[PDB]
Design a protein around this nucleic acid. Structure first.
Ligand SMILES: [Mg+2]
Ligand SMILES: [Mg+2]
Ligand SMILES: [Mg+2]
Ligand SMILES: [Mg+2]
Ligand SMILES: [Mg+2]
Ligand SMILES: [Mg+2]
Ligand SMILES: [Mg+2]
Ligand SMILES: [Mg+2]
Ligand SMILES: [Mg+2]
Ligand SMILES: [Mg+2]
Ligand SMILES: [Mg+2]
Ligand SMILES: [Mg+2]
Ligand SMILES: [Mg+2]
Ligand SMILES: [Mg+2]
Ligand SMILES: [Mg+2]
Ligand SMILES: [Mg+2]
Ligand SMILES: [Mg+2]
Ligand SMILES: [Mg+2]
Ligand SMILES: [Mg+2]
Ligand SMILES: [Mg+2]
Ligand SMILES: [Mg+2]
Ligand SMILES: [Mg+2]
Ligand SMILES: [Mg+2]
Ligand SMILES: [Mg+2]
Ligand SMILES: [Mg+2]
Ligand SMILES: [Mg+2]
Ligand SMILES: [Mg+2]
Ligand SMILES: [Mg+2]
Ligand SMILES: [Mg+2]
Ligand SMILES: [Mg+2]
Ligand SMILES: [Zn+2]
Lengths: 104, 213, 159, 75
RNA sequence: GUUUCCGUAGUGUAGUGGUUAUCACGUUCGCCUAACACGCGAAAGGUCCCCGGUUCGAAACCGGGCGGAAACACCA
RNA sequence: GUCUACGGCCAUACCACCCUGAACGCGCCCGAUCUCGUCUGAUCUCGGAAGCUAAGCAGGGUCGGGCCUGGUUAGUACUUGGAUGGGAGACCGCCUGGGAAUACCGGGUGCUGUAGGCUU
RNA sequence: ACAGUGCCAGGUGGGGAGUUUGACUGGGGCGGUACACCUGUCAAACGGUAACGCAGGUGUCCUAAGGCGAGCUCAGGGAGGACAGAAACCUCCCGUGGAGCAGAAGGGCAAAAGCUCGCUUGAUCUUGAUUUUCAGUACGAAUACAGACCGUGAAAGCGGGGCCUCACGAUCCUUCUGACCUUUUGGGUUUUAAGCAGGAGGUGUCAGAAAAGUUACCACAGGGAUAACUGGCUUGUGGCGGCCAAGCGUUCAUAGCGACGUCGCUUUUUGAUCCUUCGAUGUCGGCUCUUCCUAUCAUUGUGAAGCAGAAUUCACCAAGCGUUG
RNA sequence: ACAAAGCAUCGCGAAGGCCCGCGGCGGGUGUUGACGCGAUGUGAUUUCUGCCCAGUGCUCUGAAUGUCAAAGUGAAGAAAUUCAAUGAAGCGCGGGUAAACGGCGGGAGUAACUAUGACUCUCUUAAGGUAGCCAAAUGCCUCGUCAUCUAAUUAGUGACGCG
RNA sequence: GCGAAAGACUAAUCGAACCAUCUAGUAGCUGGUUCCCUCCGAAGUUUCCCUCAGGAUAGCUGGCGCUCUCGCACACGCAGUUUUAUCCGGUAAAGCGAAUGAUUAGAGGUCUUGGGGCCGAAACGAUCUCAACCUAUUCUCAAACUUUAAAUGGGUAAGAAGCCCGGCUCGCUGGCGUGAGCCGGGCGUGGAAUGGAGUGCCUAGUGGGCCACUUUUGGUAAGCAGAACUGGCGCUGCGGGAUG
C-alpha cells in the first residue's frame, strides 16, 4: 500500500483533530537492564545449557505496519500509534496514481 | 472397454450432466436420434409407432446405438429407404463414472485401496422413467406390422422390459389422429415440415387475414 | 466438515424474490415499531447493514429496543435442547409486523364488547372459541333426478 | 484407527428428556441492552417523580371523592 | 496410476519484469577460386506445443489439455 | 370528468402499435441582460412568453405481446403415517391423510392518499 | 622472563552426554493438509449435518482500491458517417440488465453500489450492549446503540476503513506511546528500574511443543481399534455360460461360426473390505496319500455336422475307470 | 568374511607425533630416534593405476581493510554508564592435494541396398568413464541375442554389448 | 575391558557384565478387584487439546434437597399433543414455447456470412451444399438452473404480567405531541386433551458403539465406507420367527 506523509486526525491531548506527521515505526535497540532481559541473561548463565524458547518455525511473511503519528502544532507533539493491515510493500507519499492516463 | 451394463443399470445417483463440474467426458457413443426421411410431411406419413419403458432404469449410450441400427435394418426391407422416419428420444446425457480400475502391476504392492474413491468419466447413459418413450417411428398406415417388429428387435439390445405401443396422434404431433383432417381443413393446425403449428383464436387479426384468404 | 461463515446457505434465502430487485419500497421503513410489539424477522439481500442471520431468518420475537434505524428484538433460538431467549439488533428493512397476534385483539375487542353488552340483559354469551363441531344432522335433497351413476372407467394404455 | 465423525443420534432423546424449557420469562425484565440515551433520560423521569406528588395526592382524592360521589349518586 | 521437467527460426539451444525476440548452425545471393572448399559482404525464415481465463497487453501470469522426457511404487 | 403538486401500494401500471385534447395546468417553445453551467445555452441555470398539441402526457383503440387473476391439466405428479401387501430385483399395488406445476382454454388491464385548479 | 601452570574469553569440538525426531492418515510407511478460514453443493424447504464427498478460493491487495458529495449510463447489437478494413474516431436508435461492481464463488446492486470529478480523512479518540463461531469460553469477524472531534454535502443524512461471507492469532517475552500517573520503599533530589493503560515483535501444528536419522543387533507395554495368511461377504477383473441378433460360411444367419448390444453364473484369477485370530492357528514350493466336484482330455451308449470313406469338430446321459516318463 | 605377507599414502627431530590420566614436576610407544615410532588405505605374483580440486575435507612463512571478547585503551556523564578506535584463532579470500571422501552426462544431419555410420553440427559440465572387463557374485526390461553341451536346457560354457 | 576385526567374549549373561541401593521408579497400556436385597438408572453425544488407546468441557444420572399448589366440593401451570390465526421456509414434482446452461429435429430465413461445389468470365444470377446466426417450431435434459412449486417441517400467538378509564415525571423528542417512566382508581374462567408445579447444590460412569424402516453420500458391491431421520440392541429376558 501507500499512505501520505500528513494526516489530519485526533490529537488525544488537544481533544481535537490536528495535522499529524506520519512516519512508520522501527523497534528500539534492546535494553539489557530491562527486567525480562536481566533475568533471561542470568538464568541462561552458568553451567546449564539453553533454557528459554526460540522459534525455528516462522509462518507469515509480513508484519502489520505501524504509523507513528505526531502532532504538528507545538507543545502537543504527543505521538500516537496507529496500526494498519498487512502489506508486503509499504510506502510513504509515493505519488497519487492518476486516472485516464497513458500506460507507457 | 467397459464393465457390463449390469453395474450401471440402475439409477442410484443424482444426474451428472456433462458441464463445467465434470469434464473430460468421452463423447456419447450415439449421435443421430433420427433417420430415414426426416424430410417428410405430416400429411403423407400416418403411424406413430412407439417403444416405451416399463421400469425406472438407466440405458447406456451404446445400447441406444444398437437399438436404433437394428430398427434401420428391418425397416428398410419392409418399407424401403424412403418409407419411414425413426426417432430416438433419449440422448444419453447424465454421465456415468468408474473408479479408475484399481490398477496394479503383477502381484502389486500398493493401490491405496479406497482413498479418493471418486472415479472419472467413463461414458454416458439416459435416465428412463416408466411409461416414457425411448424410440418412435412413423410410416404409412398400411405398414403397421413393419414398425411393430422393428421396435420388437430393438427391445433385445436393451435391458429390463418395455412395451411396443401404437399411438393415437398424427405421427409425431400431439394431436389425436381421429381429428387432423378436420383440424387442418379449417386451420386450427397448419403444416410445418415434420410437425405442425397449432394456431389459436388469439393473436392479431392480420395474422389470421393471411389464412382463409 | 463445512464452513462456518455467517452467510453460508443463504444463496437462495436472502435472495430477493422476483422482479423486486431494487429500490426498497419506502413504507417498509416508515411504520412505527415500539417495545412489546411482536415482529417477524425476514432477512433481505439489498440492504446488508444490520442484517439478522439465517438461524433466525423467519422467526418472531418481541421488540425490546428502538434505535434510529434498527430494532432490538428478543427471539427464541433452539440449541441442542436449551432454548435461549436472545436478543439481536436488526435493521428495520428485515422486519415486519406479524399479524400472528392480530386475530386476538380483534377477538378481545369483540369479547369485551359482547360482555359489556348482554350484561344489561344478563344472558350468557359464548365467549370462548370452540373447535369445529361434528356437522349436525341435515337432510339432503334430490328433487326429480336419481343421482348419476359412476362406473370406474376401463384402463387403456395412453402414452 | 478410524472411527465415527459425528452423529446426532439418540440425542433428540437427551436434550429432550429433561424437557426443553421455553425460558421462564418474568415481568419486569432488565433494561440492560437499551440505548443509553433512553436510560440517561428515563432515570431523570424516574428520579424527579416525587417532585409532583402533592398534585398527585390531591388530584387522586379529587377523583376519589368525585367517584365516591359517582357511586353514591348511583345509590 | 502418482510426482517432477521441458517444448521458441529448417535444427541444437539462449531470453525478459507484461511493450521488445535471439545466438550458432542451416540456407538464398554476390566475391573471391580454373572449380570446389575456406575467407569477405548482402539477405529470408516462426500463433514462442494446443487451449480457455486475467490483463492495456501474454511467447512469458493462472486453469485445462496434448506431445516428448525424468523419479518413486518401501514391512510382509 | 379531469388535471397539476406531492404521494401509497409497484405491470390489472409494462411494451408495441392505432385513434382524440374543450380549460387550467401540465408541456412543447424563444433567448442569454444577470446567476449558473457547458466544446457547443445539445443537457443545467436563468429571463421570458412570439407559436402548437407535432410528441409526453393525458384521454381513448388492438380476436396485439406481457403482467394479473379464474378454469383445465387433475384429484394427475408428488407425499405424512400405515401393513408379516406384490414383485428375483427395479420398482409396483392398496389403506389414512395431505396434495402441486406446464402446455391448453377463460376474464381483467392499475387502484386510490392529501393540497390545490379547470369543466364557473 | 617464554616455555610452563592459575583463571576468564572466543573458537573448534557424534571424541562423549541428554534429548527429540506431529497429527490426520482403507495398516502403515512415501501421496496430500481434509491442521485455521471462505464460496456453490451433499443437505431430505426453520437452523445442523461426513468421508481424503464433490466443484472452487484464502493467507490477499487499496492514499484510495474508502466518505460524503455531486455527475452522468453499463455488455451487446443495428444504422449511419475519409483515409477506417470482424476492431481506432464520431453520431442516432435499440439496449432489465446480457456490463459493471480489486478476488472464489456465491448472494447485492442503475436519473445506484455501474462510470467521471471536488473535498478530504468516519481507516480518527472513547465507554459500554449484542450477533457469529459457542461450553453459549476465548480470538477473529460483524451488528446495533451512546460520548468526543470532524468530512461531506443548499441540506436529510451519510460516514468510526474498504456494498455482505475469509481473509489473522493467548500466556510469558520484547519494543513504541500516554498521563506534572503509582512504586523505586529510614527520609529527600536526580538518573535507573517496576507498574498502570494503549499500540507493535509471534507462535501457519491457526486456543499458541525452542527439536534430524537408522536399527535384519534390537527391547517393553500393548494391539485383532493397525497390516502380511486362512476363512466370510462382494464381485470390479478373471473364467465360464446365455439371449437378440448385423455378418462369415461359394450359396445359406444360426453345419460350424458370429459383430453392435444385452442377461447371468462361478468362485481354481486378481481386487475391494477388514468380520474372526496379534497369552503369535507354522508363511512359499516339492514329495506321498486319500477323497470329492465337474468346469469331459480319453473310453461305454448316444444325438451333430458343410459326415462318403477315412478322418472331424457341435452337443446329451454320463464322472464308470484313465490323465504318464 | 578377517588377517596375512606384498603395494600405498600421512604426522612426527622429543617445549614431538601419536597416546593415556582426575592430578601432580602424572604415565605407554620408550631398555626407543625416521631402516623408528605412531596414523591410515589396498591385499600374493605378473600387467596397469585413465581423466576431474566444480562440493566437503585436509592442508599451505598465504591477504587477514571482510568480522571479532575479554580484557585492554578513547569520550560524554554525576554513575550505573554510555558512546568511540583496534582486532586471534579460528571465521570470510587465494593456492595444493584424489593410492583424501568422492565424481566421471543429452541432442541431428552425414558414406553407393537397408542399416549402420568413419565425418560434421549444437550444449552442458568440474571431467565428463580412457585399458580392460562384463548378462560376471554387478543387467531392471531378462527364457538379452548368437555358438556349443543335451532327444529336450530359464541350467552350464563360449562370443556380442548405449553397461 | 579385551577382540587376525566375526558386535567376538567379560565365569549357562554382551548392541557392552553381575551385586546391593535410589526403588511403591514411571506408565494415556494388559489382568483383577472379595456379602445379600430395594429404587433410578447411561453414554459412546459438544467445543480445545502434541488431540485419534487418553484427557478438557457440553450432555444424560443419582443423590441430596429445597419453593410452592391442592383433592380438605371450592387449582394454576407446564407440556416430542391436536386445532384456529399468522408468519417463515426453497426440498419431491414441474418447466424449460419463463432467465442460465446443455440438445435433437425438422419448417424458415442471400438475416449474416462464409467455405466447397455444380450450372455460371463473372454476376444475393440459377441451383445445389455446408457453416454459422436468428423467425415461428419440435425432441430431450441439468447437483455446482428456476418462472412455478407441494407433501413432511420451524417460529409466534390463542389475555390478570390481560383489557379498559384517570392523573403525574423527564435533562431525551418535538411548532403542540410523542415516547418512555410512574401514582391512582374501573372493569375476570378467553381454542381441544393431558397432568400437581417451580428452582439450588454435589456429582460416577460415559465420551471405540453397533442394527432396522425410510432419506442419502462415497463405491459396482459388499456383512463395504459416511450422514439424516426415526426406531432397536448395548443395557433386556419371552412367544414367535427350525437355528441364530
Ligand atoms: Mg560461561
Ligand atoms: Mg436554449
Ligand atoms: Mg401532444
Ligand atoms: Mg396529438
Ligand atoms: Mg394479451
Ligand atoms: Mg410394524
Ligand atoms: Mg548422540
Ligand atoms: Mg500416525
Ligand atoms: Mg432439512
Ligand atoms: Mg449518486
Ligand atoms: Mg458518533
Ligand atoms: Mg466500493
Ligand atoms: Mg533502595
Ligand atoms: Mg539512602
Ligand atoms: Mg543389514
Ligand atoms: Mg479387526
Ligand atoms: Mg473384535
Ligand atoms: Mg480374505
Ligand atoms: Mg452371406
Ligand atoms: Mg500352537
Ligand atoms: Mg455335464
Ligand atoms: Mg586410499
Ligand atoms: Mg585413480
Ligand atoms: Mg578442495
Ligand atoms: Mg570404453
Ligand atoms: Mg556368458
Ligand atoms: Mg543336468
Ligand atoms: Mg553386522
Ligand atoms: Mg437447496
Ligand atoms: Mg466398519
Ligand atoms: Zn494535541
Amino acid at each position: 500500500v501507500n499512505v501520505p506523509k500528513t494526516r489530519r486526525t485526533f490529537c488525544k491531548k488537544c481533544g481535537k483533530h490536528q495535522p499529524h506527521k506520519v512516519t512508520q515505526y522501527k523497534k528500539g535497540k534492546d535494553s539489557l537492564y530491562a527486567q525480562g532481559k536481566r533475568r533471561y541473561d542470568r538464568k541462561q548463565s552458568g553451567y546449564g545449557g539453553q533454557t528459554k524458547p526460540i522459534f525455528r518455525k516462522k509462518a507469515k511473511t509480513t508484519k502489520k505496519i505501524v504509523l507513528r503519528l505526531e502532532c504538528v502544532e507545538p507543545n502537543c507533539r504527543s505521538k500516537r500509534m496507529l496500526a494498519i493491515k498487512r502489506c508486503k510493500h509499504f510506502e510513504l507519499g509515493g505519488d497519487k496514481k492518476r486516472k485516464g492516463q497513458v500506460i507507457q | 472397454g467397459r464393465r457390463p451394463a449390469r453395474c450401471y443399470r440402475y439409477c442410484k445417483n443424482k444426474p451428472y450432466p456433462k458441464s463445467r463440474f465434470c469434464r473430460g467426458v468421452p463423447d456419447a457413443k450415439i449421435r443421430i436420434f433420427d433417420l430415414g426421411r426426416k424430410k417428410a410431411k405430416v400429411d403423407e406419413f400416418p403411424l406413430g409407432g412407439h417403444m416405451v419403458s416399463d421400469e425406472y432404469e438407466q440405458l447406456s449410450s451404446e445400447a441406444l446405438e444398437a437399438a436404433r441400427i437394428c430398427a434401420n435394418k428391418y425397416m428398410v426391407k419392409s418399407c424401403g429407404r424412403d418409407g419411414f422416419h425413426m426417432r430416438v428420444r433419449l440422448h444419453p446425457f447424465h454421465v456415468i463414472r468408474i473408479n479408475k480400475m484399481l490398477s496394479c502391476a503383477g502381484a502389486d504392492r500398493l493401490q491405496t485401496g479406497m482413498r479418493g474413491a471418486f472415479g472419472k468419466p467413463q461414458g454416458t447413459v439416459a435416465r428412463v422413467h416408466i411409461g416414457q418413450v425411448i424410440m418412435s417411428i412413423r410410416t404409412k398406415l398400411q405398414n403397421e406390422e413393419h414398425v411393430i417388429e422393428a421396435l420388437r428387435r430393438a427391445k433385445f439390445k436393451f435391458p429390463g422390459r418395455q412395451k411396443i405401443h401404437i399411438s393415437k396422434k398424427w405421427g409425431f404431433t400431439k394431436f389425436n389422429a381421429d381429428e387432423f383432417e378436420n383440424m387442418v381443413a379449417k386451420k386450427c393446425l397448419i403444416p410445418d415440415g415434420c410437425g405442425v403449428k397449432y394456431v389459436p383464436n388469439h393473436g392479431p387479426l392480420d395474422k389470421w387475414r393471411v389464412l382463409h384468404s | 466438515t463445512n464452513t462456518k461463515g455467517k452467510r453460508r446457505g443463504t444463496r437462495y434465502m436472502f435472495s430477493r424474490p422476483f422482479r423486486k430487485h431494487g429500490v426498497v419500497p419506502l413504507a417498509t421503513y416508515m411504520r412505527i415499531y415500539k417495545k412489546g410489539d411482536i415482529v417477524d424477522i425476514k432477512g433481505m439481500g439489498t440492504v446488508q447493514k444490520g442484517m439478522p442471520h439465517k438461524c433466525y431468518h423467519g422467526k418472531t420475537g418481541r421488540v425490546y429496543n428502538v434505535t434510529q434505524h434498527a430494532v432490538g428484538i428478543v427471539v427464541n433460538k433452539q440449541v441442542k435442547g436449551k432454548i435461549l431467549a436472545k436478543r439481536i439488533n436488526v435493521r428495520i428493512e428485515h422486519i415486519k409486523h406479524s399479524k400472528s397476534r392480530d386475530s386476538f385483539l380483534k377477538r378481545v375487542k369483540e369479547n369485551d364488547q359482547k360482555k359489556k353488552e348482554a350484561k344489561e340483559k344478563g344472558t350468557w354469551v359464548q365467549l370462548k372459541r370452540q373447535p369445529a363441531p361434528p356437522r349436525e344432522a341435515h337432510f339432503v335433497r334430490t328433487n326429480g333426478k336419481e343421482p348419476e351413476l359412476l362406473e370406474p372407467i376401463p384402463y387403456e394404455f395412453m402414452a | 484407527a478410524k472411527s465415527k465423525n459425528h452423529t446426532t443420534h439418540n440425542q433428540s432423546r437427551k436434550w429432550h428428556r429433561n424437557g426443553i424449557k421455553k425460558p421462564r420469562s418474568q415481568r419486569y425484565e432488565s433494561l440492560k441492552g437499551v440505548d443509553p440515551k433512553f436510560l440517561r433520560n428515563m432515570r431523570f423521569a424516574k428520579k424527579h417523580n416525587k417532585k409532583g406528588l402533592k398534585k398527585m395526592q390531591a388530584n387522586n382524592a379529587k377523583a376519589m371523592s368525585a367517584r365516591a360521589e359517582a357511586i353514591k349518586a348511583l345509590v
